[PDB]
Amino acid sequence: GETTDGVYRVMTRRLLGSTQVGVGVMQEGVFHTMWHVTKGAALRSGEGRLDPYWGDVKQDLVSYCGPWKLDAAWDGLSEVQLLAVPPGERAKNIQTLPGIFKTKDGDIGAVALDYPAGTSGSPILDKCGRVIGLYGNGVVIKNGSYVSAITQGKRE
Amino acid sequence: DMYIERAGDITWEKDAEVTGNSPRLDVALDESGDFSLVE
Numbered sequence: 001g002e003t004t005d006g007v008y009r010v011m012t013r014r015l016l017g018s019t020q021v022g023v024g025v026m027q028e029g030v031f032h033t034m035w036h037v038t039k040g041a042a043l044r045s046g047e048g049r050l051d052p053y054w055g056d057v058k059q060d061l062v063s064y065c066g067p068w069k070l071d072a073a074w075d076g077l078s079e080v081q082l083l084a085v086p087p088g089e090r091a092k093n094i095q096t097l098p099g100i101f102k103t104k105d106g107d108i109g110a111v112a113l114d115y116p117a118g119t120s121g122s123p124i125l126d127k128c129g130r131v132i133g134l135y136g137n138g139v140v141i142k143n144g145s146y147v148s149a150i151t152q153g154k155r156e
Numbered sequence: 157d158m159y160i161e162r163a164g165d166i167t168w169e170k171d172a173e174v175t176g177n178s179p180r181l182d183v184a185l186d187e188s189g190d191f192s193l194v195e
């Protein structure tokens with residue numbers, strides 16, 4: 001299977017034709033996506049198999065082949081880029097200044113960009129190209145618009 | 157049976173399209189990983 005670092009689509013042939021259910025990040029031999037994309041199921045990469053290694057429904061994250069490797073964090077001040085990978089469409093960068101989700105357990109950056117469900121797992125990057133989290137777990141606000149948390153894991 | 161297909165490198169793009177606002181929201185996160193607005 002392909003193990004080159006980068007962004008990948010997560011597909012299935014269970015439904016009509018070939019359907020994109022989400023997106024993920026290959027870094028340091030580990031595949032990273034949101035839990036709601038795969039529900040923790042095994043994945044295929046060519047003739048090879050990727051088995052789940054860590055996951056957490058509340059964080060809405062999952063890693064395959066090894067432990068979570070992404071540990072960059074939003075600086076709380078600068079614009080970031082969503083590397084959106086929409087279904088049937090080329091990877092495209094969108095630059096934005098994150099807002100904030102304020103919770104009882106601390107504040108999290110959030111991006112106010114609305115893409116199809118199959119875009120979940122797309123990476124959000126800082127100016128150095130480091131992945132500061134994944135897009136796709138968020139909320140629908142008053143005017144009906146979508147806002148995603150910048151969801152990041154812990155590197156043990 | 158889910159499978160993955162490469163879509164690109166992870167890099168910052170100079171002069172990318174710039175959009176989106178920056179809302180400050182009070183939210184709650186439940187045990188099922190669902191966010192909701194706190195009012």
Ligand SMILES: CS(=O)(=O)c1ccc(N2CCNCC2)cc1
Nearest residue numbers: 036060117120136137188189190
């Ligand atoms: C891919 S989607 O946009 O249809 C979508 C579906 C489910 C979810 N979950 C959030 C985390 N908790 C479970 C539900 C988030 C987004």
